[PDB]
Amino acid sequence: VQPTPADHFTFGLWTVGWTGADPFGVATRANLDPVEAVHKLAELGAYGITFHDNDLIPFDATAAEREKILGDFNQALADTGLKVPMVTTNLFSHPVFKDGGFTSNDRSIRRFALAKVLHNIDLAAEMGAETFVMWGGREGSEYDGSKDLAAALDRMREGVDTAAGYIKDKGYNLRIALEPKPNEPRGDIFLPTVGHGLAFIEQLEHGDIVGLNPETGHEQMAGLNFTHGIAQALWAEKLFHIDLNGQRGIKYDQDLVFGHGDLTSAFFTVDLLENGFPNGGPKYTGPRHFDYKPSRTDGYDGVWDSAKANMSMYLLLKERALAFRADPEVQEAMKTSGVFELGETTLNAGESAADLMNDSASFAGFDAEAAAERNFAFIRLNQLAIEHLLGSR
Amino acid sequence: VQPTPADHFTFGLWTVGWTGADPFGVATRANLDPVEAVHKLAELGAYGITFHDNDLIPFDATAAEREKILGDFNQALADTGLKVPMVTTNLFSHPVFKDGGFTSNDRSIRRFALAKVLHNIDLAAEMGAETFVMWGGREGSEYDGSKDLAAALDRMREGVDTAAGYIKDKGYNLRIALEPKPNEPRGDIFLPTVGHGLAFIEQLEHGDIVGLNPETGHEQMAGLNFTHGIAQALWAEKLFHIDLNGQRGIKYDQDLVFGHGDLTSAFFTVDLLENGFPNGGPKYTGPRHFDYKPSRTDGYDGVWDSAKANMSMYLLLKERALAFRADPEVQEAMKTSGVFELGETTLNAGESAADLMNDSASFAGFDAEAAAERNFAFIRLNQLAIEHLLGSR
Amino acid sequence: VQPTPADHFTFGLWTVGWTGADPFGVATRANLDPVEAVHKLAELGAYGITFHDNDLIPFDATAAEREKILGDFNQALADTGLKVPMVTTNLFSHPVFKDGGFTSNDRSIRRFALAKVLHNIDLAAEMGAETFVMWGGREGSEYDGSKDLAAALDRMREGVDTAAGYIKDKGYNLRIALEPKPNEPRGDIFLPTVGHGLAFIEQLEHGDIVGLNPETGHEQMAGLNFTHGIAQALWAEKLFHIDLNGQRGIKYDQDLVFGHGDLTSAFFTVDLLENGFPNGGPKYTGPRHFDYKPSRTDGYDGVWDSAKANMSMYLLLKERALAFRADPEVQEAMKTSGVFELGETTLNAGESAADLMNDSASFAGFDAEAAAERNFAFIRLNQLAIEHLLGSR
Amino acid sequence: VQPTPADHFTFGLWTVGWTGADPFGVATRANLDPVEAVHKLAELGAYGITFHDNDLIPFDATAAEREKILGDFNQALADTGLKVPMVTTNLFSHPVFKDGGFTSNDRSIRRFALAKVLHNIDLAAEMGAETFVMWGGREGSEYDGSKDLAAALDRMREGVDTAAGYIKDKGYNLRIALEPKPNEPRGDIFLPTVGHGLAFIEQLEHGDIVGLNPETGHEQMAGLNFTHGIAQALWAEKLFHIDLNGQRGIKYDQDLVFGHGDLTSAFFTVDLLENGFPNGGPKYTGPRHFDYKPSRTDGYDGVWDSAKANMSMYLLLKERALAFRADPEVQEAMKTSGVFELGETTLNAGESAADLMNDSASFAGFDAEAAAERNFAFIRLNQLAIEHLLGSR
């Protein structure tokens, strides 16, 4: 398995650039030059790179510094052919953002935050990015009386609709992707799961250009099924981008390599991304982005190894998932279990509620004890998927 | 503290009627006669009672049996004055519902399930209920390949829109409330949290009459903040009903008495229900329903005690929450922390995006290190709330 | 892969015999006759069967009836050659055990529970079991003030030490194994994890014949690493029996087939049971017992599919774990990462604390910054294990 | 409630001194001078201060510098009267400890870590500390094949037994206390809970002077009951020190003020530390140490507010826990529920196992169905505790 640019594997500058500081220790690695990151990733087979404004341009950068850095990074992009499909803003590291950007209780800070986003849209637009991600990491609270929860959602909405109105006004070819996270760094974060992000988009004035950017480990930090959550996003046609990594349980966000967390869930996520729904429906078509962090125990050989492991894991899972659905035994097990039967509408063509209540066969004369005898054989279908994942089939 | 019918405390027949069987043991209590439940609850100060069709009418009940039971229960209601504000359907106990009702993979079963709901709407309508709850407990999977996830949401939608169309057609004065749960009895349940239920309603043809019925312990089984979740439901004007109980962590659904789980979260939920949002906004106005189970260790004296503890807990929390917001020290702490400041729009009246980017004060000349110096004093506001909850203030 | 009796796969009568009642529904399958259970297990290649006293003999059975049941049961064992390696007692289903067996607050229930246990030991010895398991499923509380926590531990010890002295007194060749569970059916169970069970055994008077029976899903309900937990039990030489199954996360105990939960963790569990430790040490040589439940959506074909599947999964993982450790690339990866280096003592033969203190190259003269540059290459090592797991290496 | 030195409230230098860097941001507060820390703690009523070697003396400090820092530090202690009851070592921040101190895969890091510890013991003794705490924060792994799990336990034991023999050899009046943590910063930490720490101590050669230092938030990260866990440590008489703080659920370690996490559990923790066990037994008489971090959104006023708040919370709970146990209605509720009955031995003085077996009224003649009717009244008992907690009784 060898990734080619046709695979659409994208990486953030902050992933291979993550230096290693965590809550109990300092960096274990020297900073990564952005020019090097770009060359290195292009040599491994990446398709693109993504960044936060401050990953590249320091917060306090003078104008001359910004131009230099941008000339160096654009040179690197020209030399290697990497695309920049997504750009995001850092509204969480500077001390000013301690209570949030968009939903900070201080209004002057909310204004700076939105100003900082608006300027970043311009940059995003000039880099040719198709997606603009918003991860509101500091949007939340540690304590329940810190916020007016209705006002917090109004403030979030104001910021997101202002950013979207500006895109439309400027004619930029960008969509906004919101990225949910249940906690960390705040005790509770606003719009904690895929459902909460999707719900919120529906209250927006400009929701047509707003969708989601779900991350594997974020959903698993609430103990949810990542595959079920991205399936709901898909079904509502709101799956704009995806962040792939691994997580080993409900705890701090590990950011492991994709497939290095819950393996069977990783298998079924790849199947959904590659094979789509068994009865048909929308398919996800954007980048396969890896938002992970190389363990701080490992030196730079490990960094490149970890980048490579992401693409290898995905390609290996993909091979198994295509083999799995192509197997005739699996197709037969699917039919037996009623997977295709779920796709037939419950009612008949032009059958109303009144018509159904009235059908004796469906209710009054329905044999419930006889229907309950069906062996759905879900265990057997599960055994067949796992044997295909282990390559023994 | 003494609950009066003016408090609007409602109880399901299945809560005080829960006999005690769990996964590792049989019932520890004799069945409860429905007539007795009604009299007993009216003597404690309940306002109303709620039930599942099969809580009252056995699954296999003949016509003569159904009429008898309904005559007995309506007599009881007439004698005591209890209301029946909510009615729900049991789509989870019979073996026929092993793969779901609405999203069972077997189509004949989906038809029976919907037929069973339609008939129950009639009953609900005749009892004078304002709310019809749907809890899809068997809607989900243990294994990721058991379902076509897009088809499962189509099947759910078909059932919910059919039920809603029927309400409209019949002219019934009922709204449907969907009730999320992340897991148990299925490994993963569809529409696992408040966000997922709200998202789903937006894809519905008849979503205008569809809202939510969140339960305290269900949200806490995913480790979410119950108060933040009901605040999002409120803000979207979808909080139709509420299920109150207690939960002590991420584990099986305990169904403890309300306030017998996370106490501080219970305190802030009561504040939200009674005081509303600090800057104003919608207020929840329906029943305060308790969906709990009297621990199986306790005899019938304990059952009535537990029913009474629910209303006492709520009334005690309410007293403290009204005291808390009326305290001048708390009002001052709120202002200091920026709780009211969150309520001011970020932009000025007729200030566009372009106008803001352009304001030098907001961005280019903004002093970020100086803004970051504000002491938000959230800890102190948290200390004041807890001292009010402990009654030491 | 075809299991054979030399593989030492054992199954509980209650696993395949679980009819499907859960907290929200009744059984979906007919009761399984235990003579049939024995014949079917033996045809599939199991080596032995285990049971709870009340799995085979009803709680109400007369002596005549107990003799009758046991003669047919022993006949079936004789007909097939299945061993009975472990016997256990049901101290959780009858309403009498609602506050516990050994730690019930009621003294007369404690005496009844201990007498039930002692009689069961006599049957255990009579069947040729080498192990007597104790799962204190109802030992615990929902509420913190329900028990004196020190008296509960004194009553647990009295119960286990009386049973242990009785084995010793009668000279049975039996060992007691305690089985920890964090919760379910109690809100909090005493001795919730492997560590608590191990610690508790060291306070017993007859500790020498008391060890543990860890269960995969139980440590995963506290988000613990099952391989790390059983490693600690093995290190202490207290791993007397093991229960294998699957769990997808912190939620109710699912009891899925082994390998249908956390797959990568199942791989490393199999590596420790089969291969042991990289530098050498203890090895577990007991039976490989499956304590799971066939999903309620499936009929009896699914029941035997599911029993087969446990054995398949273990042999597939066993195979990939042998290939993995045998691989020269893996052995060199382990060497680079310092796996064998951890096996060397920190101190030199005869070096004292004073000596080390005083050795300037280990402290005063140590180059901590040089030492920190080591690439441990843990990411690469993990990528090698998963490629062996996925059958690509 | 005003704390006074007799209350024995102790604080770590790193608690009030935590500047706010978390995984997604930099410090929000200026470094706290430790002489100032001492003066401020003493003004608020603390009894003592604790510190990690590198909290006071930089890792790079010259001997001259170490002497300088220590003279001002000892002067401040002398000026104020604060004791130094516990001392600990930092074996986690420097990049050298990226794979652990005692269990690092690198042998030369293991020697450096042990020498760092031994020197620190000398300082501990010199300061008059009675307790030396060991938190093995980096002892663990992200991946299961990174370590030989048996060698890791041998290296942990070598390290703790060398330090213990050195105390014994020098005759210091010091005890070692191990502090368990399930995860963070390692994906899995060795000795993850109270039970694992207790079990581990029983395999040490110098076990007699080794006990535990449980931390509220750490057991709550595995969803365990902190009162049950510390009850087991106390029962074994291994509760040598305690770390008090708050945690809202299974997620990253929050380190909130004691009482700002699970309030009801904090109430029962305070009851066990202050009141002990209902039937009598061991009591914890050590210092009440606060291991928390002031939230990063707050300035230094919030820092001293937060330190005050820990002491307020403990005295408010202490007060309500004394009122609770003193209450004659509670004492009768406890009596009904069998709390004192659990304190009676199961067996009669001189009754053997044979005797009990053979006592027909405890088994053959037992009315199990009669016995099961007992109302244990646990719900009522819990309602009484919360009404005392809420200050309504």
Ligand SMILES: OC[C@@H](O)[C@@H](O)[C@H](O)[C@@H](O)CO
């Ligand atoms: O939890 C961190 C988060 O996942 C971060 O890497 C976001 O993805 C980024 O801020 C937006 O792309």
Ligand SMILES: OC[C@@H](O)[C@@H](O)[C@H](O)[C@@H](O)CO
């Ligand atoms: O988890 C069980 C669920 O909470 C049940 O009691 C629903 O609320 C009821 O089916 C609808 O009202």
Ligand SMILES: OC[C@@H](O)[C@@H](O)[C@H](O)[C@@H](O)CO
């Ligand atoms: O949670 C159920 C438990 O795992 C049970 O099946 C014990 O293993 C059995 O009682 C002892 O063998």
Ligand SMILES: OC[C@@H](O)[C@@H](O)[C@H](O)[C@@H](O)CO
């Ligand atoms: O998770 C941090 C840990 O709780 C730490 O502050 C230890 O308590 C300290 O290192 C030993 O005292």
Ligand SMILES: [Mg+2]
């Ligand atoms: Mg991300």
Ligand SMILES: [Mg+2]
């Ligand atoms: Mg409910």
Ligand SMILES: [Mg+2]
């Ligand atoms: Mg078991």
Ligand SMILES: [Mg+2]
């Ligand atoms: Mg600590």
